[PDB]
Symmetry: D2
Subunit: 411 residues, 4 copies
C-alpha cells in the first residue's frame, strides 16, 4: 500500500568528465553543463528523484566539480533532515579520488547506512530525461531481481554505440555486451535492442555486499557497468525495465525523451530544438517540473527599431536579464544575462549565461561558452577554414567558442 | 558610530485603496498592484527598508488584502527573529479607523521590539531611498517628526499636500492642495510635497498615537490629524528626497511615482520600454526584492509570410510564449500567452493574460488573467472602446474579464 | 498510474482550524484551539499538518476564523517551505470569503472553491485541526477508491460508553455507514462485537468533483447549518455511499506506543493530562519517533540551564520535560512540562505543572496541578495547590483540582 | 551616513589545524569543533560579520574540512546574491600555501564583488566583536592595516604574536611569541596580543597578495610575511578589542578564547555551567547563528533511592534523555542519552553521545558520537585513565570511540 519511494535513496553519479564536449567541460563536469535556458544537466535526474517521492538523495562528484558543488549547495538547499529528507553532496575523498563508479558508493557506505534505506536508486547524472522511479521500484520488488536496469528501446543500428542488455522472454538479462556490432534484438521485437540508461535499482543490503565484494577484488575496475552489473547478470538475477513504461511524457511530447548530449553537435542540437514550434522536450510542462538554481532577474528587453537596427528575437528562446539592443536573433537559445548589442546578429546560436555580443558581430551555428565576450565585428559561420583555425569546429559546422579562444585572437 | 537602522522599525501603511485606478483595484489593494514586469508596488518600500539596513518591518493592511497578504507571506519570508529580524503582517476590532489607528491597534506588537525609531512609509509609491539619511537628520535636528518631501516645481505641487518651510527647512505650515503652493525660501518656483514618509522616536510616536486615540473628533490619520498637530504645537522638519534618493548612473533624476491614475500607471510601465528609461531596473546596487518563481524562458515562435512572433521596443517576462504575435512598445508580465495573427501596441499586460488569435490591442492595460477573445479590436473605435471598457480621457483602455464577459462578439 | 502511483500525489488536505475550543476557557480567549501549544515545542495544528506532509500530500489549505492572528502567524512562520513551482502549495484561508464568517465547516470549503479548483486535485482529504494524532492518509485514500464510496470517514473504535460524546456512525458488517447520531445516549455497536462503537474523527475523504457539487447543494439549503458533520455527512449516508475507515488501520504507532494515540484535549483537565503524561517513563505518545516526525515553528535557542545546589535550593528537574531557553535557577521541578523560555527562580517549586512558553516563576512560589498560560509572570511567593477554595476563587480551577492561570487573573490580585 | 560594513567583505581563515586538540581534530578542522552546546567555533566569527552588517562572507577551508564545509552548506544557507549578499566557501599549483595565499588564489571570486574593504578573520576563536568600529578606525587613521589586539598582562602575551605600539597605537614592531613581551606606553604590565584580525582597503590587499606571491622567499603567510612587512614600510595601527567588543550586561570583561588545548577547551565549555558565566550565551542583543534542527525537549526520568535522572549545575540541550542518570557540573550537547545509574561530573559531552548504565565519568571531554560502555569508570585512576584515554596534565580525559574500541584495561 505504501509507495516504495519512501524507503528509497537516490544516488547520483556526477563525476563524469564529458570528454567529447571538449572545452565545454574543461573547467566544469558534464552534469554542471547548462541546458534549456535556465537549468543544468544534473537537475533532471535530481528533479526526477524529487518528483518520484524519493526523500533521500546523495550526489557523488569527482573531477572539476567546483561549479557543480556550488550549484548543488545553492540550488538544492531545501531538504531538512528532521523531516526525514536529506541531500548529501559527496565529493571525492570521500587518499584522493574514487577509483570508480562503484567505489563512489563503497567509500560512502557510512553515509548511507545511518539512513538505512530499503532501496538504492543509482542514477547517471549526465542525461536529460524525465522518469518516474516508482514504477522501477515496484518492478524490482515484484520480480525479486538482484538488480533492475533501466533500458532504452532503440533501433539495432543505433544500439551499436550503447551497452546492450541481452534479454529473454521475461525481460531477464542473460548477457551484457558493450558496443555490439550486431546488437541482440528483443525476443519477438527484433529491429529494436535494449540500451542501458545507467540506472540501477538495488535492495540496499544487497548493494552494500556487492560493493564490499567489489572492493576486496584486486582485478576490479570498481565500476557498476564493467564490474558490478556483469557479475550479477551471470551469478545473480538481472531484469530489464523499459523506459517507455515509466517515462513522464508530456501531451506535447511525441515520444519518450532522452538525450545523452555527449558531443558538441548533440549538445547544440538538443538545445536548438527547444526553439521549435513543437519541440521534442516540453519545458512548459507543469506536471513534472524541473527544479534548478535561479535568481530573481529583470525581464528580457528589446530596444531600437530604425532603418539600420532592430532589437528582436524570432524563432528563439530568451531568458531573463537579457538585453537585446539593436541585435537580430533567429533560431537561437539565450541563457540568463546575455547582452546583445547594436547591428549584431545571431542565428542557430546556443548562448550560455552572461555572454556579451559586441556591435556588428555576426555569428551562425555556434555554442558560446559562459561569460564569453564576443568582440565587436567578429564573424563566425561564414569562413569554415577561418572558423576552424580560431575555434573548436565540428565537422557538422558547429563552432564552440570560449574566452580562451577569443583571447588568442587579433587574427 | 553604529547605524541608526539597527535601531529602526519600518512601518508600512498598505491599506491604500487606489480608487482612481478603478477596476484595477476592485479585487486588490493598491500596494498589491503589479509593476515593472515582475514586482508589486509594495516591494519598493520594503526593499528600501531592507537595503537601508532596517531589520524590523511591519505592514498594516486593510482593503481587500487577500492577494497583498499572500504576496507578503510568500515573497517576504526570509526574516528570522533569532537574528533580530522581523516581518509582521498586521491585518485589520474590525476596521482600522485610519493610518494612525493602524499604528494604534498594533502597539503591543511594536513595544516588545522596543525600537528607538519608527519609519512610517507609504506602501503605494514607486521609488528608491536610503532611510539612513532621514534617521540621522531626525536625530541630529532634534525634531519631533521628520517628513520626506519632494522638490517639485510650483505648479505640479497643487495636487500635493505641500509643506510650508523656512530657511532651516523647519515646517511652519501644511496645506492640502494649495491653489498657489508656498515656495522654498531662496528657491521660489519649487515647493515641498509630502511623500507620506515620517520618521519618529518610538516613545514620542506612541504618545502622539495614544493622544489621537483619545480624541473622539480625530479622523485618526497621520496626514489629517497627527502631522498637522505636530506642525502647530511641536517641531516638524522636512527631509529632501533628492538628498537620500538612490539614483542609478543611468537615471537622469530622482525617480518617484504615485501611479495614482490609469494614465499615470500606464505611463510609468510603458516608459520602461524606452531605450533609456527613467527607472533603471537593471541596477544591482539597490535591488528590488519580490515574490518570484522559477519560470521557463520567454519563447518566440513562427516566422512566415503571414505571422511572426516577435517583440520590438518591448519588455517581456518569463513563462511568456509569443506565438505568431507581433508586439510593439509593450510591457508583458509573467505567463502571458499571445497567439497567432494577434498584435499588441502600447500595451501593459499583467500576468497570465491570454491573447486570442487575430486580436489587435492598442493603448491598453490588461488586468491579471484576462483571456482576450479571438479577433477583438481595441484602440480603433474610441466610442466603441469607451462603451465596452474603462477608457481614459487620453485614450488608454483598462480591460478586465468582467468587461469581456459583457461582450458577445 | 498502474496501481503504481500513490494517491497522495493527487490529493489536497483541507484542514478545518476555525475551532473555538470553548471548554478550554481562558486558554482560547485570544487564540484558536489549533493554535494551543502542546508537547513542549509544537502547537495542536502541527499534527494534522505533519500527517498530511508525511503521508505525501503536497497541497495544503488551512481554513481559519476565530481570533486566528496567532494561528496565521504560526503557519506563516513555520509552514513556509512549500514552493508552487514544485507542485506544492500551502494556503492560509482566513474568513472573509464578503464580510462576516464562514457559516460553518462546509461553507469553509464552499467559499474557497476558487482556490481549490485551479489545483484540480482528484481527492480531497478534509481534516480537523484541533486533534493530536498520527496517521498515514494514503491508507484511507486507497480504501476510498477501492470501495467506490462517496465519502470515507475516519473512525475511532472506542468503548460504547465513551462514544456518547462523539458523533457516532452506525455500520453494517462491511463498515458501510447506515446512520449517524450526534452524541447518542446509547450508541450503536459494531457487528461482531458490541461494547465498542465507531467514533468519527471528523476526517473525510472525497472525490473532489463529488465534494464540490455536494457543497454547493448545501449552500443552496437554508435549513442547513453548513457543517460537514451535521449536514454533508448525514445527507450522504442516505442518498449515497458512506464507508468507515478505522484509525487502527492507518494509525502510525511507534515501537514505544502500545495503543493508537488520539486526543481531543477539549477540556482543561484533558489538556493538562495529555501534556503531563509526556513526563512518564513510557509515554503513550512517542515524541522521539523520527519515522513520522512532527514539524513546527522553532527558533534557534540556547540550551536548558540548571543552577545552584545547596542547603536550601537546587535548580533541578525530576520526572520532567524541559525545552530550550529555559533557566532553572534554584528551582525544584517535578512531573512538570516546560515550554521554551521559562524562567523559574530560587526557592520556587513546580509540581504537576504544564508551563507554556516565556513564563516566569518568581522566587519562593509553589504551584501544584496547574496550567500556566503563555508569558504569565507568577508573583514571588504565590502558592497554588495548597487551598482549593482560595484557588477556586482566585483562578480557573477544575473539578479535578487543576488551576489554569492567566496574566489577567494574576494582576487583579489582592494580598 | 553610510555604514562601512555595506562595502566590506569578511574573509574567514578556517584552515586551523588545532593540532594540540589531538584526537578532537583528527577528522575535523578546529573551526568545526563544537562549542557552547549547539554551535561550532567558526559560528562566532561568522555571526560577528553578520551582526556587524557585513553581507559578503568568504570562508577559506583547508584540511579535514568535509565536516566544516557541510556545516556551512546547511547552517549558513540564507544569503541571496540578488540581494547584494554572498556566502562563498573557498576550498581548493595545489592547496593553500598559507593564509595570505588563501586570499590570492581567490582574487577571481573577490574582484567581481568589488568590496572597498576586506576584514580578514580567524575562524578558530570564540569572541563577540562589532567590526564597524574597526572599519571606521581604519579609514579615519589612514592606516594600511588595522589589527585587532587583545590587551593582556605581559606574561600572558608570551604565547601570542605581539605588537609594539608607540604612544598613538601605531605599530612599531611585531614579535612572534616573545619570552619578554614589550609593554604598552602609559600602562605597562600589559601588552597588545594579535587577534589575527586584519582590515585592509581591498585594492591595497590585492597588490599585497600579488607582491607576496611574487616573493620566492615567502611563507605565503599573513602575520609572518604580509603584516610585519607593512609594519616597516607602510602604516600599521592597532585596534583595541575592548573598544569594539560586544559585551553583554552580564559579562564582567571582554570575552575571547582560543581554546587551543584540551584543558582550555574543557575549561571554556564547563565555565558555561557557572551561575554567573563569563560568556553570556543568553544575550539576544548579539546572537550567534548556527546549524540547528528542530529537536524534542530535554527529558528527565526516574526518581528512586537507587537512581534519579536530573541535572545539577549543568547545561542540557535538546534531544537529551537523562534516564536515571546523575549529572553535575556538565555540559551536554544535542542528542545525548544517559542511562540508569550512570554519573557524569565535570563532563563536556558532545552531540549524540550515549552513556551506558552504571558508568561513572569525571573530568572528561567525550567526542561526538562516542558510545560509552556500560559500567565504565573514568576519574578514579589517573595512571589507568592515562593508559586508556588522552589524559591532560590537569587530569582531563578526552574520550574517542577509538580509545573505547581498543579499550580493554
Amino acid at each position: 500500500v505504501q509507495p516504495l519511494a519512501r524507503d528509497a535513496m537516490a544516488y547520483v553519479l556526477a563525476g563524469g568528465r564529458g570528454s567529447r564536449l571538449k572545452e565545454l567541460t574543461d573547467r566544469r563536469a558534464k552534469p554542471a553543463v547548462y541546458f534549456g535556458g535556465k537549468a543544468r544537466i544534473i537537475d533532471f535526474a535530481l528533479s526526477n528523484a524529487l518528483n518520484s517521492g524519493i526523500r533521500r538523495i546523495g550526489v557523488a562528484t569527482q573531477y572539476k566539480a567546483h561549479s557543480l558543488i556550488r550549484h548543488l549547495q545553492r540550488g538544492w538547499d531545501f531538504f531538512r533532515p528532521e523531516r526525514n529528507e536529506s541531500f548529501d553532496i559527496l565529493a571525492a575523498s570521500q587518499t584522493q579520488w574514487y577509483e570508480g563508479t562503484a567505489d563512489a558508493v563503497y567509500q560512502n557506505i557510512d553515509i548511507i547506512e545511518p539512513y538505512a534505506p530499503e532501496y538504492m536508486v543509482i542514477l547517471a547524472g549526465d542525461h536529460i530525461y524525465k522518469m518516474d522511479y516508482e514504477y522501477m521500484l515496484q518492478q524490482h520488488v515484484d520480480s525479486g531481481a538482484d538488480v533492475t536496469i533501466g533500458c532504452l528501446e532503440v533501433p539495432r543500428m543505433e544500439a551499436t554505440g550503447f551497452g546492450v542488455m541481452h534479454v529473454n522472454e521475461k525481460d531477464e538479462i542473460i548477457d551484457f555486451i558493450e558496443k555490439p556490432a550486431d546488437p541482440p534484438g528483443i525476443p519477438g521485437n527484433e529491429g529494436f535492442a535494449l540500451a542501458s540508461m545507467g540506472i540501477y535499482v538495488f535492495h540496499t543490503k544487497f548493494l552494500m555486499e556487492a560493493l564490499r565484494r567489489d572492493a576486496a577484488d584486486p582485478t576490479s575496475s570498481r565500476d557498476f557497468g564493467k564490474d558490478i552489473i556483469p557479475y550479477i547478470v551471470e551469478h545473480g538475477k538481472a531484469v530489464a525495465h523499459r523506459f517507455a513504461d515509466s517515462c513522464v511524457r508530456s501531451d506535447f511530447e511525441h515520444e519518450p525523451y532522452w538525450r545523452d548530449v555527449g558531443t558538441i553537435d548533440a549538445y547544440w542540437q538538443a538545445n536548438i530544438d527547444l526553439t521549435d514550434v513543437v519541440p521534442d522536450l516540453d519545458i512548459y510542462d507543469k506536471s513534472w517540473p524541473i527544479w534548478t538554481y535561479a535568481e530573481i532577474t529583470p525581464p528580457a528587453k528589446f530596444v531600437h527599431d530604425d532603418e539600420d537596427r532592430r532589437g528582436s528575437a524570432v524563432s528563439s528562446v530568451v531568458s531573463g536579464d537579457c538585453i537585446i539592443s539593436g541585435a537580430a536573433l533567429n533560431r537561437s537559445l539565450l541563457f540568463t544575462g546575455v547582452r546583445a548589442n547594436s547591428y549584431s546578429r545571431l542565428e542557430n546560436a546556443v548562448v550560455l549565461p552572461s555572454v556579451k555580443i559586441g556591435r556588428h558581430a555576426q555569428l551562425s551555428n555556434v555554442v558560446i561558452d559562459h561569460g564569453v565576450v564576443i568582440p565587436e565585428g567578429l564573424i563566425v559561420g561564414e569562413d569554415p577554414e577561418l572558423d576552424a583555425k580560431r575555434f573548436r569546429r565540428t565537422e557538422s559546422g558547429i563552432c564552440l567558442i570560449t574566452q580562451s579562444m577569443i583571447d588568442k585572437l587579433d587574427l
